[PDB]
Amino acid sequence: PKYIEHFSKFSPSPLSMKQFLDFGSSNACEKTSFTFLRQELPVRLANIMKEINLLPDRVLSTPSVQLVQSWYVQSLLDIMEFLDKDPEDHRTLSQFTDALVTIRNRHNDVVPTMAQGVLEYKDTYGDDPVSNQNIQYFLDRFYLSRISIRMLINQHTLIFDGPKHIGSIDPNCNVSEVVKDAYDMAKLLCDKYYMASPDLEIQEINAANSKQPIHMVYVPSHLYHMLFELFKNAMRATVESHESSLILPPIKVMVALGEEDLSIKMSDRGGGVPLRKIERLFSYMYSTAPLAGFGYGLPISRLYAKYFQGDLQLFSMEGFGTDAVIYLKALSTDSVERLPVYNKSAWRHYQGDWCVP
Amino acid sequence: PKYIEHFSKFSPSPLSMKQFLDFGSSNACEKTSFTFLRQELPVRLANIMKEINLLPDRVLSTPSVQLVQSWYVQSLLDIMEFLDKDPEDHRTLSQFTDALVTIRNRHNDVVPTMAQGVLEYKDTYGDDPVSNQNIQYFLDRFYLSRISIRMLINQHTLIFDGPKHIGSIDPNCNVSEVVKDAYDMAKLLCDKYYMASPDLEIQEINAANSKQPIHMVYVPSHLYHMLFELFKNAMRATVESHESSLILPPIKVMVALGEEDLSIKMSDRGGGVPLRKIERLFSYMYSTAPLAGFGYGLPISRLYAKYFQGDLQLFSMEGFGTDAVIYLKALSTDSVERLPVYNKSAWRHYQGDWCVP
Numbered sequence A, B: 001p002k003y004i005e006h007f008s009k010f011s012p013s014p015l016s017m018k019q020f021l022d023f024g025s026s027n028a029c030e031k032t033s034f035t036f037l038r039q040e041l042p043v044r045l046a047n048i049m050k051e052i053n054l055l056p057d058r059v060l061s062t063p064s065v066q067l068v069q070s071w072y073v074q075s076l077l078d079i080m081e082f083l084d085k086d087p088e089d090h091r092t093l094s095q096f097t098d099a100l101v102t103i104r105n106r107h108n109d110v111v112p113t114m115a116q117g118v119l120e121y122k123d124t125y126g127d128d129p130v131s132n133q134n135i136q137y138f139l140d141r142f143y144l145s146r147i148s149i150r151m152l153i154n155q156h157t158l159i160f161d162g163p164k165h166i167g168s169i170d171p172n173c174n175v176s177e178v179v180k181d182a183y184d185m186a187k188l189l190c191d192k193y194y195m196a197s198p199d200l201e202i203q204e205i206n207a208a209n210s211k212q213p214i215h216m217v218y219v220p221s222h223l224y225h226m227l228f229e230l231f232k233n234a235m236r237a238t239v240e241s242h243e244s245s246l247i248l249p250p251i252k253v254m255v256a257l258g259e260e261d262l263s264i265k266m267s268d269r270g271g272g273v274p275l276r277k278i279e280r281l282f283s284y285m286y287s288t289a290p291l292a293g294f295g296y297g298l299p300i301s302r303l304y305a306k307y308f309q310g311d312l313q314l315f316s317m318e319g320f321g322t323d324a325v326i327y328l329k330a331l332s333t334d335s336v337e338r339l340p341v342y343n344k345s346a347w348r349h350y351q352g353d354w355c356v357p
């Protein structure tokens, strides 16, 4: 596919959070955003479409991958229409926004579509550790790509519609408020289905300014998604491990701001999980087989954290409880898109040194 | 080297903690231990000597590696003398114990010898990430091998000298007491050099038996080494981050016992460290360049944890503090030696898919 072949030769250009802010500083930048995105979106679409073809034919020929592939092909064709059009024509700029909304909505069902493909592979070829490693590698990259493409589309369509927040970015995101929002939603669900919910305790440590409420530049909807998913797991674990107790331990959150990290630790006393099992919570193949369908899930939550050079880590004490830490870059200049790229370095990934008794 | 070549074709036989207990249950088992070790020690020596030869010549020909290689060669020659001797002769059994003590003492300086080699490589060839990955891979395996060989020697020489503890194993190790022993030693040093020390707070969660003090089968000297090293770092961090404070936060320890894990979490409020840097604490190349020379160090502490299928993990909140968790197998049947083996799976280890702005 030569049109895929053309754009796949470029690599995506990852943007900083600071660079996103300067793209939405004014509605005059719409021409600049249009000329940027009409090249960059085909580059990002084509790079991931080329990686999808590295999948073995027995994966490539399943209906769910063909369906998703057909969406990317169409989305790419929609965009490369605008490659010769005139940015000084306000009809070109509005038809471009229209086309971006259509592309976003066309791809809305990708997550359950790919999940259905994982389910099929488990039953048509099995769930061995080597298959699992390839699924992890591919889906982490495919979903991060998808997050980055939605980010670009959201920043354009939200800003140039026709300002404190800048599209999906809040330059003064109050982290503790997003924590409380996510807790409140999870509590609402947990009270409904379990007739009980732990309370919340929040503390902040602003190391450099001990009195200042902690703010940052971030995408608050991503931070909400991660926190909501963590709260859901921590509340269900706390309730189910205390069936015979009257007091529910609270869920505790510490928000810390350092020179480089902004860290959010959540802590439960919900009984914990053995170290040998805990990483299964981030495995796409484990995660496929009440509160089940309310959030994005733990694998995707960690990708949201990684998208701007952060991370999401779990560590548990079996018999006691579990902690989760969201790590975010404290500086907007360090908050840069983490994007997959297709080359031969990725090409060879797709292609017994300890003793046993 | 054919004598190396012979034994390197066998793979080490990792033993369980339960299997160690049955080897020291009686002093009549000395013949059994002798016939076992006179085969097993050459197997373990030869396997790691073969791996040392996979090192490039520019590493192999440095004085420190030649020195260590000369010790293993001699130790191997000492042992394979006993291959034809009669186990029913009590003179053979005592000369064997004598030979094991000599071999142990001959190898006593291996850690600073190999550290000197790392220092030389950094200055004669540099510290790039690829060199670092090979150093990590090799030294983790070389040191775990060395720990396993010392374990076997200790179990023989301590038991068949001429019983609650079984050589270096305590079948009723009171974990909180070893925690306090290690804390007390670190406090003694910290008071001496810093004129101050945090206090200790310990709690236990015995999930299955809430009133029972937590005991396990383990090697208490290994557990002491890890705890001592962690306490040293946590105390120095707490004191140095509170130069201008009057109150020192305590160091907190939770000991939890689950169905599969026994976990020991230590917590400090010593200011923390950014996520991007924390793994350098386990890097041999970082770790080479007061309390400096009192413990075994963090890399080796984690290997002690891994030796019987455990782990040692750090997680920090920059601007606040740091936690460490030692994870141990709760069941003596799950506590099995983690041994490196030399084959082609290890042979190929010695032999750019994300975007940058």
Ligand SMILES: *S(=O)(=O)c1cccc(Oc2ccc(-n3c(=O)[nH]c4c(NCC)cc(F)cc43)cc2)c1
Binding pocket: A229, A230, A231, A233, A234, A237, A266, A267, A268, A270, A271, A272, A273, A277, A278, A279, A280, A281, A298, A314, A322, A323, A324
């Ligand atoms: S399966 O039986 O092999 C299996 C493997 C791994 C995990 C599980 O089940 C779980 C699910 C969820 C949790 N869990 C908690 O108990 N607490 C959390 C938290 N807490 C945030 C503070 C976050 C989280 F993502 C998961 C959690 C444990 C075991 C079954």
Ligand SMILES: *S(=O)(=O)c1cccc(Oc2ccc(-n3c(=O)[nH]c4c(NCC)cc(F)cc43)cc2)c1
Binding pocket: B229, B230, B231, B233, B234, B237, B266, B267, B268, B270, B271, B272, B273, B277, B278, B279, B280, B281, B298, B314, B322, B323, B324
């Ligand atoms: S260097 O400047 O690049 C660098 C990289 C990584 C780490 C450091 O310096 C340290 C050393 C030690 C610690 N540290 C703590 O502050 N607390 C601990 C603990 N606590 C146990 C509860 C354990 C530990 F192993 C190390 C600790 C932080 C930074 C410099």
Ligand SMILES: CC(C)c1ccc(COc2ccc(CC(=O)NCCN)cc2Cl)cc1
Binding pocket: A054, A055, A056, A059, A064, A065, A114, A115, A116, A117, A118, A121, A130, A131, A134, A135, A138, A139, A350, A351
């Ligand atoms: C549905 C989607 C998410 C999905 C489902 C299933 C898979 C499975 O993907 C595999 C499985 C095995 C191998 C090894 C292999 O055969 N290598 C080539 C050997 N010649 C490679 C890949 Cl990419 C991926 C993605």
Ligand SMILES: CC(C)c1ccc(COc2ccc(CC(=O)NCCN)cc2Cl)cc1
Binding pocket: B054, B055, B056, B059, B064, B065, B114, B115, B116, B117, B118, B121, B130, B131, B134, B135, B138, B139, B350, B351
């Ligand atoms: C002193 C000891 C601990 C020490 C010091 C230094 C080292 C460095 O070891 C290296 C460095 C680079 C490479 C890549 C390479 O060259 N591969 C082969 C390419 N033909 C492999 C190894 Cl094993 C190891 C151990």
